[PDB]
Design an enzyme around this catalytic site. Structure first.
Site, mmCIF file in Angstrom:
data_model
loop_
_atom_site.group_PDB
_atom_site.id
_atom_site.type_symbol
_atom_site.label_atom_id
_atom_site.label_comp_id
_atom_site.label_asym_id
_atom_site.label_seq_id
_atom_site.Cartn_x
_atom_site.Cartn_y
_atom_site.Cartn_z
ATOM 1 N N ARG A 116 -7.396 -6.108 -12.342
ATOM 2 C CA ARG A 116 -8.728 -5.673 -12.706
ATOM 3 C C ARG A 116 -9.702 -6.795 -12.365
ATOM 4 O O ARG A 116 -9.354 -7.981 -12.416
ATOM 5 C CB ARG A 116 -8.805 -5.315 -14.200
ATOM 6 C CG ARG A 116 -10.158 -4.744 -14.593
ATOM 7 C CD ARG A 116 -10.297 -4.483 -16.064
ATOM 8 N NE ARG A 116 -11.676 -4.098 -16.338
ATOM 9 C CZ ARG A 116 -12.261 -4.175 -17.523
ATOM 10 N NH1 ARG A 116 -11.624 -4.656 -18.580
ATOM 11 N NH2 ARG A 116 -13.504 -3.722 -17.658
ATOM 12 N N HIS A 117 -10.918 -6.416 -11.989
ATOM 13 C CA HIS A 117 -11.962 -7.405 -11.784
ATOM 14 C C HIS A 117 -12.184 -8.180 -13.077
ATOM 15 O O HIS A 117 -11.765 -7.761 -14.160
ATOM 16 C CB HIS A 117 -13.266 -6.736 -11.353
ATOM 17 C CG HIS A 117 -13.738 -5.694 -12.311
ATOM 18 N ND1 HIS A 117 -14.297 -6.017 -13.529
ATOM 19 C CD2 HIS A 117 -13.680 -4.342 -12.264
ATOM 20 C CE1 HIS A 117 -14.598 -4.904 -14.178
ATOM 21 N NE2 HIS A 117 -14.226 -3.873 -13.436
ATOM 22 N N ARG B 16 -4.492 9.856 -8.611
ATOM 23 C CA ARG B 16 -5.421 8.744 -8.413
ATOM 24 C C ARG B 16 -4.725 7.484 -7.929
ATOM 25 O O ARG B 16 -5.358 6.656 -7.262
ATOM 26 C CB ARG B 16 -6.183 8.418 -9.700
ATOM 27 C CG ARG B 16 -7.139 9.485 -10.131
ATOM 28 C CD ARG B 16 -8.188 8.957 -11.111
ATOM 29 N NE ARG B 16 -8.451 7.539 -10.907
ATOM 30 C CZ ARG B 16 -9.623 6.951 -11.108
ATOM 31 N NH1 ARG B 16 -10.671 7.629 -11.545
ATOM 32 N NH2 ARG B 16 -9.749 5.651 -10.853
ATOM 33 N N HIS C 287 -9.855 -1.968 -10.586
ATOM 34 C CA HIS C 287 -10.573 -1.565 -11.798
ATOM 35 C C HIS C 287 -9.598 -1.223 -12.918
ATOM 36 O O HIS C 287 -8.394 -1.069 -12.701
ATOM 37 C CB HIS C 287 -11.475 -0.355 -11.533
ATOM 38 C CG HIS C 287 -12.394 -0.542 -10.376
ATOM 39 N ND1 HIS C 287 -13.644 -1.104 -10.508
ATOM 40 C CD2 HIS C 287 -12.252 -0.239 -9.062
ATOM 41 C CE1 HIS C 287 -14.229 -1.154 -9.323
ATOM 42 N NE2 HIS C 287 -13.410 -0.626 -8.432
ATOM 43 N N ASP C 288 -10.175 -1.137 -14.121
ATOM 44 C CA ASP C 288 -9.443 -0.762 -15.324
ATOM 45 C C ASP C 288 -8.591 0.484 -15.095
ATOM 46 O O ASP C 288 -7.400 0.508 -15.426
ATOM 47 C CB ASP C 288 -10.469 -0.560 -16.449
ATOM 48 C CG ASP C 288 -9.859 -0.556 -17.822
ATOM 49 O OD1 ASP C 288 -8.892 0.200 -18.036
ATOM 50 O OD2 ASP C 288 -10.334 -1.330 -18.688
HETATM 51 NI NI NI Z 1 -9.746 -2.127 -20.393
#
Ligand code: NI
Ligand SMILES: [K+]
Length: 405
Positions: free
Chosen positions: A18-19, A262, A298-299
Site C-alpha cells: 500500500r502507498h 479485481r 492501494h488498500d
Molecule cells: Ni487500511
C-alpha cells in the site's frame, strides 16, 4: 563461527505495498456536518503522499535491504545491477512517490526506475480491471455474497457493531454536530449496498465511518499533535475505531466474488515474477523473473489479494489491517535438501507506534511481520510454505480469465 545450517535459500521476493501516509482524498460537507470541531489541515493536496509518509516508506526500504542482504539475495554494498530490483507503481501521485521512497531506502543514490503505464493521466487496469471495463462483476452473485458476509443485511452488520459506532460518535462529539442538531450515526445515515458492473460501495454511516477512522489513523501516523481532537487516548480506542474501516474492506474488497476479479491482473504479475523461467522483458518493460519486485498500490489491492488467495490476518499493534506502507510479501524459497521450490507469504507493516514515533527500522528494530498460510494449499513444507506447484494451482483457480490483461 558456526552459523545456523541453511535449510532454505531465498530466490525471489515480490512486495505488494500500500502507498504510504497520504492526505485525505475528500473534504465533504458530510464530514463537516458530523462534528462541531474543525478537521486538521494537511501539508499536501488531497490524496497526495506527505513527506513524512515518504520517510516512513523509506524506512521499510532500508529494512528490506538489510534483511535481503542477510538472506543473501542482494549485495551489502553498491547498487543492485541489471534490473535485479524492479519497481512498478500505479499512476497516482501517492503510489509513484511511494515507489520512489522505497527505492530511496532500499538503494540510496541508485536511481532505480519507478515504472508506470505509459499514460499516467488515465487509470492502470493492473490495479483494478473493473475501472477500465476489462471485465464486470456479476451483480446477483456479488450482492448475495456481500449481504451474507454482512450477517444477512446491512442492518444486521451495523446492529452488531454499535459499540464501535458509539466510539466514533464520542470522538466526533457527534451529539453537538449540525447533523445531530435537528442521536445516532447509523440511523441518521442509513447504509445500503450499491452494486454495479464496475464497483461495489456502501452508503451512509458504514462508508463514512470507514473513511473517518482511517483519517484519525493517518493523523496519528503523520505526527499531528492531537488526532481526533485529543479524544483518542488508548489502544483499545484505536482498535475499536479502525474495526469499522476493517469491516468495510472485509465486505467490499475481501469478498471473493469481488476480490478474484479485481485481483486477477496482480495475481498474474505476481505469479510471473515468482515463476522460474528465462528472464524476459514483459509488462512495463520490466524483465521477469528477477530478484526483487516492488509494486506500489492501494488498500483495496491488499484486501483483494487476501480474499482471492484466502490469506487471513490481523496486525498486532496496527489497528488498520491494511495500513499505509503495509506489504504483502511473496517469497520463493529453494529447499536445499532436494532443491524443491516453495512460496512463503507474509504481511509486513509498521506498528501504529512505529509510525507515531517515526521509528527508523533495522534488523535490531524490525517492522511487524505476520506469517500467512494459503488456506487452499494442500502441499506444505515444514515452515508452512506452499509448494510452487500448489501455489500455481491456487492462483490458476482463483483468477478470473475475463479480468486478465
Ligand atoms: Ni487500511
Ligand atoms: K447477525
Amino acid at each position: 563461527g558456526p552459523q545456523s545450517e541453511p535449510e532454505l535459500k531465498l530466490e525471489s521476493v515480490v512486495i505488494v505495498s500500500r502507498h504510504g501516509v497520504r492526505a485525505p482524498t475528500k473534504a465533504t460537507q458530510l464530514m463537516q456536518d458530523v462534528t462541531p470541531d474543525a478537521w486538521p489541515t494537511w501539508p499536501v493536496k488531497l490524496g497526495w503522499l506527505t513527506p513524512r509518509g515518504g520517510e516512513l516508506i523509506a524506512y521499510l526500504g532500508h529494512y528490506q535491504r538489510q534483511r535481503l542482504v542477510a538472506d543473501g539475495l542482494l549485495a551489502k554494498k553498491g547498487c543492485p545491477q541489471s534490473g535485479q530490483v524492479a519497481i512498478i507503481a500505479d499512476v497516482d501521485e501517492r503510489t509513484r512517490k511511494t515507489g520512489e521512497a522505497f527505492a530511496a531506502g532500499l538503494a540510496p543514490d541508485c536511481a532505480i526506475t519507478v515504472h508506470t503505464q505509459a499514460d499516467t493521466s488515465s487509470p492502470d487496469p493492473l490495479f483494478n480491471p473493473l475501472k477500465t471495463g476489462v471485465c464486470q462483476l456479476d451483480n446477483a452473485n456479488v450482492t448475495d455474497a456481500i449481504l451474507s458476509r454482512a450477517g444477512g443485511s446491512i442492518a444486521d452488520f451495523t446492529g452488531h457493531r454499535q459499540t464501535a459506532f458509539r466510539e466514533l460518535e464520542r470522538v466526533l462529539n457527534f451529539p453537538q454536530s449540525n447533523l445531530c442538531l435537528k442521536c445516532s450515526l447509523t440511523q441518521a445515515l442509513p447504509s445500503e449496498l450499491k452494486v454495479s458492473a464496475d464497483n461495489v460501495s456502501l452508503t451512509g454511516a458504514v462508508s463514512l465511518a470507514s473513511m473517518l477512522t482511517e483519517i484519525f489513523l493517518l493523523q496519528q501516523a503523520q505526527g499531528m499533535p492531537e488526532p481526533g481532537w485529543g479524544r483518542i487516548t488508548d489502544s483499545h480506542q484505536w482498535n475499536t475505531l479502525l474495526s469499522l474501516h476493517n469491516a468495510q474492506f472485509y465486505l467490499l474488497q475481501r469478498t471473493p466474488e469481488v476480490a478474484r476479479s479485481r485481483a486477477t491482473p496482480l495475481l498474474d504479475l505476481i505469479k510471473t515474477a515468482l515463476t522460474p523461467h528465462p528472464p524476459q522483458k514483459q509488462a512495463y518493460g520490466v524483465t521477469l523473473p528477477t530478484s526483487v519486485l516492488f509494486i506500489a498500490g492501494h488498500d483495496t489491492n491488499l484486501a483483494n489479494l487476501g480474499g482471492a488467495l484466502e490469506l487471513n490476518w490481523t496486525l498486532p499493534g496496527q489497528p488498520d489491517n491494511t495500513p499505509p506502507g503495509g506489504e504483502l510479501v511473496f517469497e520463493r524459497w529453494r529447499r536445499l535438501s532436494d532443491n524443491s521450490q516453495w512460496i512463503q507469504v507474509s504481511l509486513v507493516f509498521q506498528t501504529l507506534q512505529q509510525m507515531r514515533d517515526k521509528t527508523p527500522l533495522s534488523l535490531n528494530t524490525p517492522p511487524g511481520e505476520v506469517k500467512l498460510t494459503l488456506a487452499g494449499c494442500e502441499e506444505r513444507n515444514a515452515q508452512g510454505m506452499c509448494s510452487l506447484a500448489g501455489f500455481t494451482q491456487i492462483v490458476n483457480e482463483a483468477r478470473i480469465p475475463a479480468c486478465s490483461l
